[PDB]
Structure formats: structure tokens, C-alpha cells
Design a protein around this motif. Sequence first.
Motif, PDB file in Angstrom:
ATOM      1  N   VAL A 196       0.858  -1.183   0.000  1.00  0.00           N
ATOM      2  CA  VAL A 196       0.000   0.000   0.000  1.00  0.00           C
ATOM      3  C   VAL A 196       0.895   1.233   0.000  1.00  0.00           C
ATOM      4  O   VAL A 196       1.830   1.325   0.804  1.00  0.00           O
ATOM      5  N   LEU A 197       0.612   2.172  -0.898  1.00  0.00           N
ATOM      6  CA  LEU A 197       1.361   3.425  -0.921  1.00  0.00           C
ATOM      7  C   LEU A 197       0.964   4.293   0.270  1.00  0.00           C
ATOM      8  O   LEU A 197      -0.217   4.340   0.631  1.00  0.00           O
ATOM      9  N   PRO A 198       1.910   4.995   0.898  1.00  0.00           N
ATOM     10  CA  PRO A 198       1.548   5.875   2.006  1.00  0.00           C
ATOM     11  C   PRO A 198       0.871   7.135   1.492  1.00  0.00           C
ATOM     12  O   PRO A 198       0.875   7.403   0.278  1.00  0.00           O
ATOM     13  N   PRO A 199       0.244   7.918   2.373  1.00  0.00           N
ATOM     14  CA  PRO A 199      -0.363   9.181   1.922  1.00  0.00           C
ATOM     15  C   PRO A 199       0.629  10.325   1.750  1.00  0.00           C
ATOM     16  O   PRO A 199       0.220  11.398   1.287  1.00  0.00           O
ATOM     17  N   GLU A 200       1.903  10.142   2.101  1.00  0.00           N
ATOM     18  CA  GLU A 200       2.846  11.255   2.073  1.00  0.00           C
ATOM     19  C   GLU A 200       3.513  11.458   0.718  1.00  0.00           C
ATOM     20  O   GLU A 200       4.551  12.128   0.659  1.00  0.00           O
ATOM     21  N   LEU A 201       2.960  10.905  -0.364  1.00  0.00           N
ATOM     22  CA  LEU A 201       3.483  11.223  -1.691  1.00  0.00           C
ATOM     23  C   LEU A 201       3.169  12.663  -2.077  1.00  0.00           C
ATOM     24  O   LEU A 201       3.860  13.254  -2.913  1.00  0.00           O
ATOM     25  N   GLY A 202       2.124  13.243  -1.480  1.00  0.00           N
ATOM     26  CA  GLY A 202       1.855  14.655  -1.685  1.00  0.00           C
ATOM     27  C   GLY A 202       2.953  15.547  -1.146  1.00  0.00           C
ATOM     28  O   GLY A 202       3.197  16.632  -1.683  1.00  0.00           O
ATOM     29  N   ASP A 203       3.624  15.113  -0.076  1.00  0.00           N
ATOM     30  CA  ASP A 203       4.748  15.876   0.454  1.00  0.00           C
ATOM     31  C   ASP A 203       5.941  15.827  -0.494  1.00  0.00           C
ATOM     32  O   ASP A 203       6.765  16.749  -0.516  1.00  0.00           O
ATOM     33  N   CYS A 204       6.055  14.755  -1.279  1.00  0.00           N
ATOM     34  CA  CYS A 204       7.086  14.685  -2.308  1.00  0.00           C
ATOM     35  C   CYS A 204       6.784  15.694  -3.407  1.00  0.00           C
ATOM     36  O   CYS A 204       5.701  15.673  -4.003  1.00  0.00           O
ATOM     37  N   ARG A 205       7.741  16.581  -3.677  1.00  0.00           N
ATOM     38  CA  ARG A 205       7.487  17.673  -4.612  1.00  0.00           C
ATOM     39  C   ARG A 205       7.702  17.251  -6.061  1.00  0.00           C
ATOM     40  O   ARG A 205       7.067  17.801  -6.966  1.00  0.00           O
ATOM     41  N   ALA A 206       8.581  16.283  -6.305  1.00  0.00           N
ATOM     42  CA  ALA A 206       8.957  15.931  -7.666  1.00  0.00           C
ATOM     43  C   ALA A 206       8.766  14.453  -7.983  1.00  0.00           C
ATOM     44  O   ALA A 206       9.489  13.919  -8.827  1.00  0.00           O
ATOM     45  N   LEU A 207       7.813  13.785  -7.341  1.00  0.00           N
ATOM     46  CA  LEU A 207       7.535  12.388  -7.637  1.00  0.00           C
ATOM     47  C   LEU A 207       6.156  12.253  -8.269  1.00  0.00           C
ATOM     48  O   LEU A 207       5.160  12.725  -7.713  1.00  0.00           O
ATOM     49  N   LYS A 208       6.106  11.605  -9.428  1.00  0.00           N
ATOM     50  CA  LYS A 208       4.886  11.428 -10.200  1.00  0.00           C
ATOM     51  C   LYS A 208       4.531   9.949 -10.285  1.00  0.00           C
ATOM     52  O   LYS A 208       5.283   9.079  -9.841  1.00  0.00           O
ATOM     53  N   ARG A 209       3.359   9.678 -10.862  1.00  0.00           N
ATOM     54  CA  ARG A 209       3.021   8.310 -11.240  1.00  0.00           C
ATOM     55  C   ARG A 209       3.989   7.804 -12.302  1.00  0.00           C
ATOM     56  O   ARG A 209       4.409   6.641 -12.280  1.00  0.00           O
ATOM     57  N   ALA A 210       4.354   8.677 -13.245  1.00  0.00           N
ATOM     58  CA  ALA A 210       5.403   8.350 -14.203  1.00  0.00           C
ATOM     59  C   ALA A 210       6.746   8.160 -13.508  1.00  0.00           C
ATOM     60  O   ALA A 210       7.478   7.209 -13.812  1.00  0.00           O
ATOM     61  N   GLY A 211       7.088   9.056 -12.579  1.00  0.00           N
ATOM     62  CA  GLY A 211       8.330   8.902 -11.840  1.00  0.00           C
ATOM     63  C   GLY A 211       8.328   7.670 -10.954  1.00  0.00           C
ATOM     64  O   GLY A 211       9.233   6.837 -11.034  1.00  0.00           O
ATOM     65  N   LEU A 212       7.302   7.528 -10.119  1.00  0.00           N
ATOM     66  CA  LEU A 212       7.118   6.322  -9.315  1.00  0.00           C
ATOM     67  C   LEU A 212       6.412   5.290 -10.181  1.00  0.00           C
ATOM     68  O   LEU A 212       5.219   5.026 -10.014  1.00  0.00           O
ATOM     69  N   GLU A 242       3.474  -1.245 -10.480  1.00  0.00           N
ATOM     70  CA  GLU A 242       2.324  -1.984 -10.977  1.00  0.00           C
ATOM     71  C   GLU A 242       1.035  -1.270 -10.573  1.00  0.00           C
ATOM     72  O   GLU A 242       0.972  -0.590  -9.544  1.00  0.00           O
ATOM     73  N   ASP A 243       0.002  -1.419 -11.410  1.00  0.00           N
ATOM     74  CA  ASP A 243      -1.190  -0.578 -11.303  1.00  0.00           C
ATOM     75  C   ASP A 243      -1.951  -0.810 -10.001  1.00  0.00           C
ATOM     76  O   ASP A 243      -2.605   0.111  -9.489  1.00  0.00           O
ATOM     77  N   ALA A 244      -1.874  -2.022  -9.446  1.00  0.00           N
ATOM     78  CA  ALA A 244      -2.534  -2.297  -8.173  1.00  0.00           C
ATOM     79  C   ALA A 244      -1.838  -1.572  -7.028  1.00  0.00           C
ATOM     80  O   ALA A 244      -2.367  -1.489  -5.915  1.00  0.00           O
ATOM     81  N   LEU A 245      -0.634  -1.054  -7.281  1.00  0.00           N
ATOM     82  CA  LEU A 245      -0.011  -0.147  -6.327  1.00  0.00           C
ATOM     83  C   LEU A 245      -0.384   1.300  -6.622  1.00  0.00           C
ATOM     84  O   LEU A 245      -0.406   2.133  -5.710  1.00  0.00           O
TER      85      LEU A 245
END
Lengths: 39, 40
Positions: free
Chosen positions: B3-19, B22-25
Amino acid sequence: PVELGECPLLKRSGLVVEEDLFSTLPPEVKERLWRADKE
Amino acid sequence: FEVLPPELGDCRALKRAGLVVEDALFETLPSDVREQMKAD
């Protein structure tokens, strides 16, 4: 940088760069650029 | 991954393309986080 995908008017013909450097971009943003290009 | 954490919003330069994952993640962000993430 991935922020080049943020530019709406830019496309593949607009973004003239080497193939490897273009491939450094993530696959899905490249797919977005391709789809905006060909239509 | 599980499960991905909710703190990807705090990451300023990480995208779905960047991260690239697999789609279930990809399907694991909270709804307000989806609202903040679709608008980056």
C-alpha cells in the motif's frame, strides 16, 4: 525533466531531441506526448 | 509493495510516471490525496 510534459502546446515535432534523452522520460508521459502528437 | 503511504503529496517531484509501479499499487491513494494529486 518531466516538467516538459506539463507544457500543453509542446509535442514530439516541437520537442526535437535525441532518442535516448527522450527515452529518459517516464513511459506514460511519453505516451501522453505521442497521443497529443498523432491524434 | 503493499500500500502506498499518503505522504506522496509531500514529495514535490515524484509522479506516477516517476514512481513507476504496478497498477494495483497505483490504485492506493486516499480520495482527498487523489484530488490533490490529479492536480499535482
